[PDB]
Ligand SMILES: O=C(C[C@@H](NC(=O)OCc1ccccc1)c1ccccc1)Nc1nnc(S)s1
Ligand SMILES: [Ca+2]
Ligand SMILES: [Ca+2]
Ligand SMILES: [Ca+2]
Ligand SMILES: [Zn+2]
Ligand SMILES: [Zn+2]
């Protein structure tokens with residue numbers, strides 16, 4: 001596993017999240033559950049707890065955007081960059097942006113929202129990319145991951161535990 005440099009991490013165990021806007025691609029129920037399933041994956045192997053907010057600035061702000069969106073890292077249209085997230089911290093740190101030029105499905109085939117979200121949240125937690133090919137955090141997880149058999153790898157686990165005990 002790898003972490004970000006200087007090892008940023010959350011300094012509290014109770015974190016909030018807010019889903020700002022929705023993707024045309026799916027029903028809202030479907031996005032709520034993708035996200036919620038993704039946070040729970042992580043919540044099961046760390047002493048952290050996530051609670052949803054409907055207003056205010058939540059620690060982890062989740063939104064859908066295209067091209068330029070208020071940070072230095074413009075989306076790039078269909079394909080390539082799918083999403084981006086920031087290491088733990090205040091303001092924009094911990095936030096996750098999803099490329100709405102992508103076609104978000106609940107499928108085994110296509111860009112799966114649950115899987116991308118699960119990977120992006122590892123970054124919001126303080127994990128960087130892994131060399132282990134079976135890891136959720138390896139860069140090509142999006143293509144090699146068989147959703148039927150979905151589980152955190154031991155690498156994933158050893159990494160988040162080295163941060164949160
Ligand atoms: O690779 C990162 C880092 C992110 N930038 C960040 O977290 O800077 C804060 C920071 C920096 C250093 C130490 C502590 C905090 C970023 C965001 C946008 C573009 C490039 C990088 N994000 C990823 N999201 N999805 C991935 S796949 S990679
Ligand atoms: Ca934030
Ligand atoms: Ca893209
Ligand atoms: Ca879309
Ligand atoms: Zn507290
Ligand atoms: Zn962004």
Ligand SMILES: [Zn+2]
Nearest residue numbers: 119123129139
């Ligand atoms: Zn990544």
